[PDB]
Amino acid sequence: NHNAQALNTLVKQLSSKFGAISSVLNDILSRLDPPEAEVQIDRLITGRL
């Protein structure tokens, strides 16, 4: 059970925005310019690390 719960959390965090515009990287890259895309990707990367 413990292991399962851990993994589940690790997947649910992938749906967290962490202050970014969206939790999907493809959406960010297909909707913003690289300069602001960098800020959004940085927030997502910090959260997921």
Binding site: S16, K17, F18, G19, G47
Partner: protein, 49 residues
């Protein structure tokens, strides 16, 4: 020596103390109240994490 032994001729009954921790304080933290207190804006921002 090849042929020397030492045999006790009396005894001492010694009482010693061994102190061992068993349990620690049980603490519960309310995440919302600690991070945000009574602010609703903080709670809404926390929901994203």
């Amino acid at each position: 020596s090849n042929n020397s032994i030492a045999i006790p001729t009396n005894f001492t009954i010694s009482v010693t103390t061994e102190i061992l921790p068993v349990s620690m304080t049980k603490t519960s933290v309310d995440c919302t109240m600690y991070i945000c207190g009574d602010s609703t804006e903080c709670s809404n921002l926390l929901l994203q994490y």
